Amino acid sequence: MPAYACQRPTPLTHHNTGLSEALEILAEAAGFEGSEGRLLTFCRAASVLKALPSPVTTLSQLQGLPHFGEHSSRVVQELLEHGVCEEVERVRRSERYQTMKLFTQIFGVGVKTADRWYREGLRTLDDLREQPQKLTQQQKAGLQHHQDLSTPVLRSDVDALQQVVEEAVGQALPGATVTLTGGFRRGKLQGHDVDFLITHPKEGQEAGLLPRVMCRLQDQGLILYHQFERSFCIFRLPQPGSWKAVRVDLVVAPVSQFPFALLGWTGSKLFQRELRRFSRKEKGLWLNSHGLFDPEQKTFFQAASEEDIFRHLGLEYLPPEQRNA
DNA sequence: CGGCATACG
DNA sequence: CGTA
DNA sequence: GCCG
Ligand SMILES: Nc1nc2c(ncn2[C@H]2C[C@H](O)[C@@H](COP(=O)(O)OP(=O)(O)OP(=O)(O)O)O2)c(=O)[nH]1
Ligand SMILES: [Ca+2]
Ligand SMILES: [Ca+2]
Ligand code: NA
Numbered sequence: 001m002p003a004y005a006c007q008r009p010t011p012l013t014h015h016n017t018g019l020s021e022a023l024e025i026l027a028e029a030a031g032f033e034g035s036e037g038r039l040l041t042f043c044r045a046a047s048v049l050k051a052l053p054s055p056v057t058t059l060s061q062l063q064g065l066p067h068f069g070e071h072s073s074r075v076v077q078e079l080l081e082h083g084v085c086e087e088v089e090r091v092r093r094s095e096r097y098q099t100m101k102l103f104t105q106i107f108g109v110g111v112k113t114a115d116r117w118y119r120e121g122l123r124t125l126d127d128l129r130e131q132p133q134k135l136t137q138q139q140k141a142g143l144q145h146h147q148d149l150s151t152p153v154l155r156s157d158v159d160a161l162q163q164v165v166e167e168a169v170g171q172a173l174p175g176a177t178v179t180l181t182g183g184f185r186r187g188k189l190q191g192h193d194v195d196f197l198i199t200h201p202k203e204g205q206e207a208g209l210l211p212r213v214m215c216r217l218q219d220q221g222l223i224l225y226h227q228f229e230r231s232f233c234i235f236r237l238p239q240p241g242s243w244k245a246v247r248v249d250l251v252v253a254p255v256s257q258f259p260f261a262l263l264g265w266t267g268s269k270l271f272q273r274e275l276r277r278f279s280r281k282e283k284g285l286w287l288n289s290h291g292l293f294d295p296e297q298k299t300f301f302q303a304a305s306e307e308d309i310f311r312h313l314g315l316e317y318l319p320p321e322q323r324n325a
Numbered sequence: 326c327g328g329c330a331t332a333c334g
Numbered sequence: 335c336g337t338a
Numbered sequence: 339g340c341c342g
Binding site for chain 2: 037040227230231264275280286
Binding site: 249267289 | 335336337338
């Protein structure tokens, strides 16, 4: 088992679901306390289990696995012997964990804002609604739409949405294309938001495109909230006899950068962090969603495909469905 | 021990 | 600060 | 919290 998640296939469904979910609770709780290092270790340990070919049934099976030290091993040991880990359950039922989770899941609220509100004594969404003076426009939209945004978007919703985006994109710039990215590209059947990547086959034609796309979607009455090359929006999605609010991310990239943007925006988040860490620490190359830079030659790699990028980095290619780290 | 992804709005 |  |  290699140490970086980008070095091994990770399928969406696997053989250690309960163990990985418990470790991910501890990772999330570490994030709420500002401990990014502990968050990473717990996420990496959970991801190792997702990549295993069969269930862990005995503690011995963790020997040699990366990211399993005393703490993550004890969590697994308690789950194997008792079906529950006391530390995990204590986190789950803690006021701090529950409130930080509730607040950070609001669009416009991160860990830092959630933590400040927590320290001020705030605990519920109604607490926030009573003091709207405290809220940015973005947070007001996130709070008003919170219920709909807490409902998963179904893969079965996505195609009709892609068609409306494609119509606005085609008016904004004929020949421009729309690619579904994010978790849905990795095979997920649900998500918290839909992610689209827009480009045009003629380099440079995409300049200034996103404002034109947004204006057209707004004029069609589809945008409940927005506000360049990235837009984090709230869209109106049709439902039987009504509609629901959905989060949609739109990104524009020049075609020269499209494979890098496709790779970055397809995730998973941990996969991309691990891939960029591998690139820098093992290969000496700097990776982002625009390119891959050799800081010794001061040159950018050209890529025409995601396959090119994996080859550049000396890694076996993984299709999106195996990037569910 | 240092390091932990890397960007845009 | 927020967002991916 | 863990790796190197
Ligand atoms: N506000 C909010 N954020 C969420 C929720 N579920 C997951 N997240 C966070 C976890 C990650 O930091 C981030 C992942 O979103 P992305 O669109 O970048 O990733 P991906 O498409 O894999 O995830 P998704 O399936 O849409 O949840 O969103 C949720 O219900 N609400
Ligand atoms: Ca997203
Ligand atoms: Ca998504
Ligand atoms: Na949030």
